[PDB]
Design a protein around this motif. Sequence first.
Motif, PDB file in Angstrom:
ATOM      1  N   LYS A 191      70.447  25.927  46.271  1.00 25.09           N
ATOM      2  CA  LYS A 191      70.868  24.591  47.021  1.00 25.09           C
ATOM      3  C   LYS A 191      70.283  23.375  47.370  1.00 25.09           C
ATOM      4  CE  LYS A 191      73.141  28.307  47.556  1.00 25.09           C
ATOM      5  NZ  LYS A 191      73.769  29.334  48.425  1.00 25.09           N
ATOM      6  N   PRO A 192      71.421  22.364  47.522  1.00 27.39           N
ATOM      7  CA  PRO A 192      71.006  21.247  48.204  1.00 27.39           C
ATOM      8  C   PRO A 192      70.751  21.857  49.609  1.00 27.39           C
ATOM      9  CG  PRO A 192      73.433  21.239  48.055  1.00 27.39           C
ATOM     10  CD  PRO A 192      72.723  22.067  46.961  1.00 27.39           C
ATOM     11  N   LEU A 193      69.887  21.107  50.055  1.00 27.54           N
ATOM     12  CA  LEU A 193      69.371  21.233  51.416  1.00 27.54           C
ATOM     13  C   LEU A 193      70.468  20.652  52.205  1.00 27.54           C
ATOM     14  CD1 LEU A 193      65.538  20.022  51.600  1.00 27.54           C
ATOM     15  CD2 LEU A 193      66.571  22.310  51.775  1.00 27.54           C
ATOM     16  N   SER A 194      70.644  21.191  53.359  1.00 26.86           N
ATOM     17  CA  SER A 194      71.451  20.565  54.411  1.00 26.86           C
ATOM     18  C   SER A 194      70.549  20.380  55.594  1.00 26.86           C
ATOM     19  CB  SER A 194      72.612  21.530  54.758  1.00 26.86           C
ATOM     20  OG  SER A 194      73.371  21.123  55.844  1.00 26.86           O
ATOM     21  N   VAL A 195      70.308  19.068  55.883  1.00 29.14           N
ATOM     22  CA  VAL A 195      69.567  18.683  57.075  1.00 29.14           C
ATOM     23  C   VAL A 195      70.592  18.059  58.080  1.00 29.14           C
ATOM     24  CG1 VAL A 195      67.709  17.217  57.910  1.00 29.14           C
ATOM     25  CG2 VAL A 195      67.681  18.143  55.516  1.00 29.14           C
ATOM     26  N   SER A 196      70.864  18.714  59.184  1.00 36.03           N
ATOM     27  CA  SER A 196      71.912  18.265  60.108  1.00 36.03           C
ATOM     28  C   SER A 196      71.254  17.992  61.430  1.00 36.03           C
ATOM     29  CB  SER A 196      73.017  19.320  60.298  1.00 36.03           C
ATOM     30  OG  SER A 196      73.506  19.614  58.995  1.00 36.03           O
ATOM     31  N   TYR A 197      70.800  16.708  61.580  1.00 34.29           N
ATOM     32  CA  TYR A 197      70.039  16.279  62.728  1.00 34.29           C
ATOM     33  C   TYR A 197      70.819  15.348  63.668  1.00 34.29           C
ATOM     34  CZ  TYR A 197      65.520  18.048  60.662  1.00 34.29           C
ATOM     35  OH  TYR A 197      64.455  18.735  60.171  1.00 34.29           O
ATOM     36  N   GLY A 253      58.250  19.945  54.815  1.00 33.12           N
ATOM     37  CA  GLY A 253      57.073  19.143  54.675  1.00 33.12           C
ATOM     38  C   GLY A 253      57.329  17.896  53.939  1.00 33.12           C
ATOM     39  N   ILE A 254      56.810  16.769  54.492  1.00 36.50           N
ATOM     40  CA  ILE A 254      57.050  15.422  53.940  1.00 36.50           C
ATOM     41  C   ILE A 254      55.728  14.704  53.885  1.00 36.50           C
ATOM     42  CG2 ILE A 254      58.280  13.277  54.249  1.00 36.50           C
ATOM     43  CD1 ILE A 254      60.431  14.859  55.767  1.00 36.50           C
ATOM     44  N   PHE A 255      55.343  14.232  52.677  1.00 32.76           N
ATOM     45  CA  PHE A 255      54.085  13.503  52.528  1.00 32.76           C
ATOM     46  C   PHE A 255      54.200  12.072  53.056  1.00 32.76           C
ATOM     47  CE2 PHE A 255      53.938  16.592  48.897  1.00 32.76           C
ATOM     48  CZ  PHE A 255      52.888  17.325  49.381  1.00 32.76           C
ATOM     49  N   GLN A 314      55.430  32.082  42.900  1.00 29.40           N
ATOM     50  CA  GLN A 314      55.927  31.065  42.037  1.00 29.40           C
ATOM     51  C   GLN A 314      56.523  29.955  42.912  1.00 29.40           C
ATOM     52  OE1 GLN A 314      58.738  33.000  39.478  1.00 29.40           O
ATOM     53  NE2 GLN A 314      57.190  33.128  37.846  1.00 29.40           N
ATOM     54  N   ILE A 315      56.191  28.735  42.624  1.00 32.99           N
ATOM     55  CA  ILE A 315      56.782  27.600  43.300  1.00 32.99           C
ATOM     56  C   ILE A 315      58.027  27.157  42.483  1.00 32.99           C
ATOM     57  CG2 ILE A 315      56.484  25.238  44.083  1.00 32.99           C
ATOM     58  CD1 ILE A 315      53.533  25.878  44.381  1.00 32.99           C
ATOM     59  N   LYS A 316      59.134  26.973  43.169  1.00 35.77           N
ATOM     60  CA  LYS A 316      60.388  26.600  42.538  1.00 35.77           C
ATOM     61  C   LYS A 316      60.705  25.161  42.878  1.00 35.77           C
ATOM     62  CE  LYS A 316      61.301  30.709  40.630  1.00 35.77           C
ATOM     63  NZ  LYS A 316      61.175  30.765  39.139  1.00 35.77           N
ATOM     64  N   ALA A 317      61.334  24.507  41.935  1.00 37.61           N
ATOM     65  CA  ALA A 317      61.768  23.125  42.156  1.00 37.61           C
ATOM     66  C   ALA A 317      63.288  23.079  42.204  1.00 37.61           C
ATOM     67  CB  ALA A 317      61.307  22.228  41.007  1.00 37.61           C
ATOM     68  N   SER A 318      63.810  22.149  43.058  1.00 38.90           N
ATOM     69  CA  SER A 318      65.226  21.970  43.195  1.00 38.90           C
ATOM     70  C   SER A 318      65.786  20.951  42.188  1.00 38.90           C
ATOM     71  CB  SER A 318      65.519  21.403  44.552  1.00 38.90           C
ATOM     72  OG  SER A 318      65.177  20.039  44.706  1.00 38.90           O
ATOM     73  N   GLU A 336      64.510   9.002  51.108  1.00 39.36           N
ATOM     74  CA  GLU A 336      65.855   8.895  50.541  1.00 39.36           C
ATOM     75  C   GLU A 336      66.291  10.219  49.882  1.00 39.36           C
ATOM     76  OE1 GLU A 336      66.082   5.541  47.638  1.00 39.36           O
ATOM     77  OE2 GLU A 336      67.500   6.829  46.481  1.00 39.36           O
ATOM     78  N   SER A 337      65.430  10.753  49.017  1.00 40.59           N
ATOM     79  CA  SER A 337      65.743  11.945  48.296  1.00 40.59           C
ATOM     80  C   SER A 337      65.366  13.220  48.978  1.00 40.59           C
ATOM     81  CB  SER A 337      64.978  11.929  46.937  1.00 40.59           C
ATOM     82  OG  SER A 337      65.304  13.103  46.187  1.00 40.59           O
ATOM     83  N   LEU A 338      66.203  14.257  48.871  1.00 41.35           N
ATOM     84  CA  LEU A 338      65.873  15.600  49.350  1.00 41.35           C
ATOM     85  C   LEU A 338      65.410  16.532  48.268  1.00 41.35           C
ATOM     86  CD1 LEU A 338      68.609  16.061  52.135  1.00 41.35           C
ATOM     87  CD2 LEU A 338      66.236  15.332  52.350  1.00 41.35           C
ATOM     88  N   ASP A 339      65.060  16.038  47.071  1.00 42.79           N
ATOM     89  CA  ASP A 339      64.483  16.879  46.039  1.00 42.79           C
ATOM     90  C   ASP A 339      63.221  17.562  46.615  1.00 42.79           C
ATOM     91  OD1 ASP A 339      66.350  15.972  44.102  1.00 42.79           O
ATOM     92  OD2 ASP A 339      64.993  14.710  43.156  1.00 42.79           O
TER      93      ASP A 339
END
Length: 257
Positions: free
Chosen positions: A42-48, A141-143, A251-255, A183-186
Amino acid sequence: HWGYGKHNGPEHWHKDFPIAKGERQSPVDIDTHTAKYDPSLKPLSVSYDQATSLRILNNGHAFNVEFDDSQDKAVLKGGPLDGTYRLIQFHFHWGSLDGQGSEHTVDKKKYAAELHLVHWNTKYGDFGKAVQQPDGLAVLGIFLKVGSAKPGLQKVVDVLDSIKTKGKSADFTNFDPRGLLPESLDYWTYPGSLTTPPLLECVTWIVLKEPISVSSEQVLKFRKLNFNGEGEPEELMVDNWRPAQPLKNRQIKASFK
Ligand SMILES: [Co+2]
């Protein structure tokens, strides 16, 4: 006690917290070429929208912006996650210089800072019980890179004078964490740990690919905080980051492709 100095820093933590040398420690380097796209994520669901910030606290290692987590007000769901994870606090890790500060790295690149939005799995009832489970937490985590200012950060920066030293808090109501997101949740995701003692192996990490930009002035105000308490010798709160740990059998996975 533990900290980020020569005598009490990351290299020492294993003595009191042997899990520091464990099988799923964080942070890690994200090797972008070896991460694999996982079409079943999934897309992430961020519900703030209903977030209720309460307070900001200098805890001696970072500052935490704390939320009311007694109801599903600000929640993370979807992505790699099963179930509902409630926002408890966010904080940052940052450097003494713009060339370091992040915990995760991307192809060995270090960012100036890293924002951690910490959430706990509601199936476990409270934070303290969640940290004892392998799927207890989800940290977003956000850079941060230095460039333009981040408008939504400014209210945080401007309260920092009032919490200069360890153990100081201030009211911090009505802060909207949506203003800290790119902007992106990737994202990339992997199983890991808290990056500070007790280093518990309870975190599903979700690290966004797109950094946010903050200004030089904003990060400079982070670096005016103190690790020490009031009336103690001044030690600037900088370089509160743990370096990358061995990936081991993960293993690191990418969305995203
Ligand atoms: Co953190």
